[PDB]
Symmetry: D3
Subunit: 349 residues, 6 copies
C-alpha cells in the first residue's frame, strides 16, 4: 500500500534542504494554511499567494502552494469575504495548502540571492552576513581501559556521528591516570548527552563539561559575487534590467563608476549597504530603496541599484528547479510548476 506524499512528508523534505529554523524570529514560516495529513496532488510556487495564484492552483488540480512571502504575517484578526480574507477563505474552501518559505529561503546557500546572482550571470557567488550556530565541545575524563565501551555506548546511542572522538592523556587528582575524551554536539543535544554520559560513565559521580563553541553558519542574508568583466555602474544596471526583465531600474552613484564586486539582498535590504561596502562590495543591489536612504548613500559614496522588491519573483522558477531535484532524489513523481502570473502590484509607465 502506497506511501503517497502527505503535506507532513513535504514539510520534512523542505525543512531538510531549507531549514525553517534559519528564518528570522519575527518571520512566519512553514505550513500557514492547511492539513499535514492531506495527500499532495501537485505543487505551485509563487512569490505572493494572490487570488489569481489560488485560482491557478485550482485550475491545474494542485492542492499545495509554496510562496516566498507569508500570506499571514501578523496574525489575522478576521476572515471575511474581502481583502486577504477572500484569499485565505478560498484556500480553505478548496482544500488548498499554503506553505511559506520566507526568510529561510532568503538566507539559504541556494536561496533567493544565489538565484538573483545566477540570473545576473555573476561568478564567485558566496553567502554573506553569515549566521552563527551554537555547538558544544563535550569533554569527559575516563580511565584508559574504560575508554572503548564508554565510546561504543555513546556512539551506539548516536553521539559523535561516526565515532568522532579526540583522545588526550593526562593525570587526575598524579593519583589517577585518565583519558580526556572530546567530541562535538549540536546545541539541542546537551541534555541527552548529559543523560547518556551519566548513564554509561565508570565514575559514580562522573566529571564532564560542555564548552560552548560558535561556528560560522553556511546560512546568511545576501551574497557577494562578481561580474565576469569589470564594467560601469550604468552598464551593470542596464544589463541586469534586461536579464531580469525589469520595467524600470534606478541607481545611485556616478554612472561611469567601475564595478566588479556586487552585494545582493533581494527584497528590501536597505540597512545592509554600508556593511556590504565594508565587506568589499562596489555596489549594493536591492529593492524598495527610498529617497533619504539613496541621498545618504550618494553623499557617502555607497553605490546602489534598485532592481525592485518584485525581482524576488526569480524564486518561483528557482524553487521549482530545486524542488524537482529534491523530488528526483527521493523518487517522488509529484508535479511542480512555477506560477506564471505576474503579481507585481506596480505597473510602470
Amino acid at each position: 500500500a502506497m506511501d503517497p506524499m502527505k503535506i507532513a512528508d513535504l514539510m520534512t523534505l523542505l525543512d531538510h534542504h531549507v531549514p525553517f529554523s534559519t528564518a528570522e524570529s519575527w518571520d512566519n514560516v512553514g505550513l500557514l494554511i492547511g492539513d499535514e495529513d492531506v495527500e499532495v496532488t501537485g505543487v505551485l510556487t509563487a512569490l505572493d499567494c494572490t487570488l489569481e495564484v489560488v485560482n491557478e492552483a485550482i485550475e491545474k488540480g494542485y492542492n499545495t502552494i509554496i510562496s516566498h512571502h507569508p500570506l499571514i504575517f501578523k496574525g489575522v484578526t478576521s476572515l471575511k469575504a474581502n481583502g486577504y480574507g477572500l484569499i485565505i477563505r478560498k484556500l480553505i474552501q478548496h482544500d488548498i495548502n499554503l506553505i511559506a518559505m520566507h526568510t529561510n529561503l532568503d538566507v539559504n546557500p541556494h536561496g533567493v540571492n544565489m538565484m538573483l546572482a545566477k540570473v545576473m550571470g555573476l561568478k564567485n557567488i558566496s553567502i554573506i552576513n553569515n549566521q552563527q550556530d551554537v555547538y558544544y565541545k563535550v569533554q569527559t575524563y575516563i580511565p584508559k581501559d574504560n575508554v572503548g565501551p564508554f565510546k561504543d555506548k555513546l556512539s551506539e546511542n548516536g553521539l559523535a556521528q561516526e565515532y568522532c572522538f579526540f583522545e588526550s592523556e593526562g593525570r587526575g587528582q598524579e593519583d589517577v591516570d585518565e583519558v580526556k575524551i572530546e567530541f562535538m554536539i549540536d546545541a539541542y543535544q546537551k541534555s541527552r548527552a548529559e543523560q547518556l554520559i551519566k548513564q554509561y560513565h565508570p565514575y559514580e559521580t562522573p566529571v564532564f563539561d560542555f564548552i560552548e563553541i560558535k561556528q560560522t553558519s553556511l546560512y546568511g542574508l545576501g551574497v557577494m559575487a562578481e561580474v565576469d568583466n569589470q564594467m560601469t555602474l550604468e552598464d551593470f544596471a542596464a544589463d541586469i534590467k534586461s536579464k531580469l526583465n525589469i520595467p524600470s531600474v534606478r541607481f545611485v552613484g556616478e554612472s561611469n563608476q567601475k564595478i566588479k564586486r556586487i552585494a545582493i539582498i533581494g527584497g528590501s535590504g536597505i540597512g545592509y549597504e554600508y556593511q556590504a561596502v565594508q565587506q568589499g562590495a562596489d555596489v549594493f543591489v536591492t529593492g524598495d530603496i527610498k529617497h533619504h536612504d539613496a541621498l545618504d548613500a550618494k553623499i557617502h559614496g555607497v553605490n546602489l541599484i534598485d532592481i525592485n522588491h518584485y525581482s524576488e519573483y526569480v524564486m518561483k522558477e528557482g524553487l521549482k528547479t530545486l524542488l524537482m531535484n529534491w523530488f528526483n532524489i527521493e523518487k517522488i513523481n509529484i508535479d511542480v510548476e512555477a506560477s506564471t502570473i505576474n503579481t507585481d502590484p506596480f505597473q510602470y509607465i
Copy 2:
C-alpha cells in the same frame, strides 16, 4: 430581505454598539461573508468545535458568541487546535460574530443577565463610560461627536456671515454603557447564604467566597468573567460584595485583609448570555418583523470538570 449578515450586523450594532467594546477587543463579524442570507442564529459563550457541529446539525449558518474565537491574530490555520474550528466554520459556510466587551458593558448585557438570573432588584450599570457630544453655538443645539465634520460642512455652507460665527463646545456626559451592575437582594442575607443562593440559581458546581460567612449582604456588584481590579472601586460605590470569576489566591488574600468581600462564581458563569442573548435577539427580530429562528447553544463548554 431575506436578512443578510450585513443586515444582522446593523441591527446588533444598533442595540449593542460595537464601538462600546474595549479598544483591545476583537468584535463584529470575525469569520464569514456579509452578503450571505442568515438561515438561523445559535448563541454561544465559547465557539467550540461541538458548537460548530450543533449549528450545522440545526441548519444554522450564523453563530454569535460572547468570546471572540480569534482574539490575537492567528498566525496559522491548520487542522489542529483552534485551527480546526475556524476551518470547519469556513468549510461549512458558517458565519461567526463576536459580541464581546460591547455585551459586557450593555445595559441589557452580561451583567444585567447575571443580576436577573440571581433574582436581584434595583439593578443599575456601574463604571459608566463617558460620551462626548458638542453643544453647537445666537442659536444652540446638540450633536454627536461624529457629526462635528458634517455639521461644519453644513454650518459653513449657509450663513449670512462672510465668515459665519459658530462654536463647537465639547460636552461630556455619563454613558448608559459600563462594566458591571450594582443591584440588591430583597432582604439582607448572610454572605454564605447569598453565595449558596447564587450557586443554586446559576447551576454552579462549586462556588467560593472571601469574607466572614455571617457578613450581611444587601448591595451587590457584579462583573461577569474576570473582573478582579474593580473590587475596591465597587466597595467605594456601595457594594457589600463583589461577584466575579477567575479569582486568584493573592487577590483574594488582599481583599480579605482589606475587608473586601468577594464571591467567585467562575468565569464560566457568563454562559447565562446564551439564553439572555437569544431572548434579546428574538425581541429585536419581533420589532423588525424578521422571521428567523434563534436558539441558545445547549452545549456545556466549561473546560473544567469539578469534583
Copy 3:
C-alpha cells in the same frame, strides 16, 4: 532694513507658521546668524554640496530648503559626508533655513504646488489640524490659546468684582493647515492616462501605479514625499487614487488587494517646491516692498538615476 535673517524668519513664520510643523521635525534657522543681512535667497529641496556652491556663485547668503539638512542631531562635523556641506555653509557665512513639514501642511504649500503642477481643480487641504481657541466669558469674545495667560493678567486686573467672574471655554476648530490636498481633474480619465499625464507634467523619468489601468479617476488625493499610511483615509475622504512617493512592495500589494489605487510619483517630486516657494516669497517680498532676489535652485538633486 536692510532685511536681516531675523526679519526673514518673522515673515516666513507669518505665512507658513513654523508651529504647524510636526513635533518630531526640525525647522527654522538651522545654520546661521540671525543678525546677518540677507543678500539673496536660493530655494532648494535638499541642500546638497552643489546647492551650496550655487548659492556662493550667485552671491546669495541664504538658502531655504524643504528637507532639513540637520534632522537628528549631528554628533560630529568633519570634512566628510554631510559634514562637508554644513562646514561649507558656515565657512562661507551662508544661512540655511528649513521649511519642512510646515510647508507640507500649508494651504499654499507642497501639496497645493503638486496639484497645480498637475493642472488640477477644486483643490482643498485634507487631514486638517485642530486649532484650540478660548471663548472668554455677561460678555463673550474669542482668543488664541496662547492669549489665555495675558488675557487673565488683563481680566483679573480690572473688574468691578473683588473676584471678577470669568470663564475660558476651550473651543476646537478645524485648521486651515493639513497634510495633503484633495483635488480633481476636469474630466474623468483612466488611471493609466492620469499617471502618464502627471509623469509628463512633472518631468518624471518613471512613474508606477497600483490598480487596473482602466480604473476611472476624478478625485485625487496627494501627499508629496512619503505619504503611505494615509491612503485608506484618502479613499474614505472620496479619493479615486492616492498620489505619493516612496511606495514599497508590501504597501502597494495591500492597497491592490483592498482596491485602493495608488500612484508613485517618487519622493523627489517634492522638487516642485523650489519654484513654488520662489513664487510665494517674491509675492510676500512685493507686499512688504523688500527688494531682495529669490531664485529656485536649478540643480537636479535626485540621488536616483533611472534607466
Copy 4:
C-alpha cells in the same frame, strides 16, 4: 558563655540548605522584618503571615516566623494601622522576626513540589525546569618542576576544593615543555583565582584562562513524578483532593484519560503546562487556573488539575520537618511548629 542561635545564625543555616540565591530575581526573600542580632526563641512556619499567624507566634512565645509567601513583596509605601500595615506593625511592636523562603523553596529539591508529590503518594520524583549554574574551568600553563608548590599554594588558599586538578603535558613556544593544569571554580571566585594565580605563578607574566562552563543545577521549578499504578484522570484528581484535604478540585481533560506521569508546580504555574507535556507529563498539576487557559489546554489536549494555590500550605509541616532535622544536625534545641491556622482566603460551598 553560650552561643544561643541569633537570627543571623538561623539565616546562614536556611541559606545553606535552601539558598536564597536560587530565588527568582523579582522575588523578595530572606529576613523581611526583624533584627539579625536577636536571639531566636522559637520558630513558626506559615504559608502566608496573616494577623492570626502573628497572634499565634505571640501566644506561643515564638519570635520568629518563616513564611513561604513574602508579606512585603512590592515595597510598602506606608505602615498604617490597617491592612497589611497592621500585620507589619504588630510584628515590629512585638519584636517578631519574619523570614520569607519563597521561590528558593519552590525550586529546592526538598521544597514545595517535592512536598506536594510526597503528600500525593507519588514515586520517582525529580526536579524539572532546572536552573543553569555558571562555573569556570581555570587553565594555567606551568613547568613540570614548578607544578607541586604552585598546586599546594593554590590549594592552601582553598582553590580546587580537595586538591582536584587535571594535568596535561605539552610544549609552549618546542621551546618550552609545560604542564597545562586545569581545575574548576564557581563563578564568584574568578577574581580571587586571578589574584592567587598571578601571585604564586613561576612566570613574571603568567598565562591563564577562564573558560565559562554551564552545568545543570539541582534546583528547578516543579517536579515530575509518577503514580504507583496508571489511573484515570478523574480518579487521580479525587485521590489528591482527599490526600491534600481540598474542598474542591477541578480538572481539564477526558475524565477517563490514563495518567502515569505527573508534573507539579504548586501555586500558580500556568505558563509551564505545554513544556511539562513536552517533558513527558500526562497531566500538569497547579493552582489558580483561569478559564481561557483551561480552554486552550482542553483544545490542545493538555490535561490539567487545579488543586488550588492554597495547596502550597503543605510547606508548613514540610518546612517544620526539614528545619527540625537541620537543627538536630547542628544540635540546636529551638522549637519549631507548623502554624495550624487555615489562612485560605477562600471558603468553598
Copy 5:
C-alpha cells in the same frame, strides 16, 4: 477632641491639600495610627534617627517632615539603615506625616518661606497648576470637578423634564498652587552681593553662583530643593536669576553659556520649612482652638559638612 491623627490630617489637607502633590510622590500619613491622640508635633526636613529621638525626648508622638521617609516602597524593615528609623517610630508609637510636594507648591509653602527668609518683596507663585471646574448649564453655576457625579445624581433627580436638559462645560483655571515663586529685592544688587546676602540670611556654609559677579539682579525665581529643569522657563517668566539646590556641573555650564544666571543655595536650604511649618500649624491650631504644642526640630540633618 482631643485631636487625633485623623483630625490633624483633615486640617493639614484643608490648608495644604495632599492632592496638589505630584503623582509620583508619597505624602500623608506614612507611618502611624489615625486613631491615636496627638500629644505634640515636631517639624522636620528629613526624619533622621536623631529627629525620632528628639520627638521621644520632648514627649511628642507626631512628626511632620517635608521629605518622605518612605518614598519608593521599602522591601524590608531590618535593624539597619532607614529600617532603624522606621522601626523606632513604630516601636515608640510615633506617627510620621509627610508634607512633601504639596508643601513645595503651596502659596505659603517652601518657596514662600525661602523668599521670606531672604527678605524678598512681591512674592508670587509661578509654574501654576490648572484646576478643572465645570460650569453646569437656562440656569448656570459652578462646581468642582469632583461634584460632577453628585450634581448629576441631584440634577437628574428633580426636573420638570422627563429628560432634564443639562450640560457640564469643562472650564480650566489657573491654580493658586505651583512650583516656585518669583519675587524681587527692594533695590537692584549685584549677583555676587545677592548670593552673599542669602548665604548669610540662610546660614549656609557655602554658596555658589553661575553668571558674572557684576550682573544686576532685581527679579528672582526660587525652587527649593532640586529645581534644575525650570531655569530656562524662569528666565522666560522674567527672572534675573534662578535659585535652587543640587546644581551639577553640566547644568551650570549650559546655563552659563546661555546667559542664564543661577545660585546654588544647596538642597538642604529647604530646612527653612521646619520653622515655617511650625508657624503655620500654630496659627491653624489657634483658629480651631487646638491647644497642642508644635516645635521645629533643632537638629541640623545636613549629611554634608563643609570645609
Copy 6:
C-alpha cells in the same frame, strides 16, 4: 618631503595610548569637529571647550584642541550664533579642530583618576571597576609532520604574535595521531583566523574551534589608592582641598573617621560608592554629590567627599604631560599647552 603630523596621525597616536574603543557606548569621542587631512600647528588641552578656550587657541596659533568633555554630546539640531552654536561655528570658521578624549580617558590607567590620585599625593594606585575584554582560544588539530609549515604560515600572516603556540598530542578518530595546537586571538580576528586556517590546513575539511575567553582589562572607571599615613576624614578632605586648590569641599561621614584606602571617580561617580566600599574603600571621592544620595550614604556609613566635578580640570596639565611624552617618543616637535582658563561655571562665596 616632510611628513608633518596631520589630524589623522594625531588620532592614531591618541588612540594607541588611550583607545577610543574603551569609551562607554553612549559617549561621543574622537574627532568631533574638524578635518583629518589638516596639518596640526599646535595642541591646547582643555576640560570643557568654552568660547574663551577657542579664543586662546586662536591667539596662540594652535589649530587643535583636545578636551575631556565632548562639546557635542547629544547631536546638535542647529548651529546658530548663540550658545554652543557660537563655539562650534567659531571652531569651524577658524579651522580649529576639536577632539574629545572623554570616558576613554576616565578609564585609562594613566587617565583622569590616576591624575587625581597623583595630585592628592596618594600611593599604591590601581584601576578599579575593570572592563572585560573578549578573546578567543583557537584550537586546531593537525598531523605532526604538518605542524611546522602550518604554524609558519599562520605566523607569516600575523597570527599568534611572535609564534606563540601551545602543542598537545592526542589521537583523533586511535585511527589518527594528531597535534592539537592552540593560540590566542583578539575578538576582531576570528573571521581572518577562519580564513587563514581553512587556507593553510592539511585537511580538506579542517577541524578548528574558537573558545571565548574573557580577561580582566587594564581599563576601568576609578582608582583605589592609599594615603601615606592613615588620617581623619576631615583632615583628608582639607588636604585634598588644598592640593587641588578647590574653593569649597564637603564630606559625608564622622569628621574623625580614620581613612586609609580611597576610591576616586572624578566627575560625577555617584552610583559607585557602595561598590567602592565593597572593594575596600574607606571613602569615595567624586563630584556633583546631591542631598538624597549623601543622606543615603550617611545612614549606611558610606563615607564621601565631594571635590566637585570641576576637579577633573587636572587632566589639562596631565594630558599635556602625557602628549608631550608620546610626541617625544615619536620625535614630533609640535607644541602642547594646557589651557590656563578656569572654565568652572561656578563661583564660590
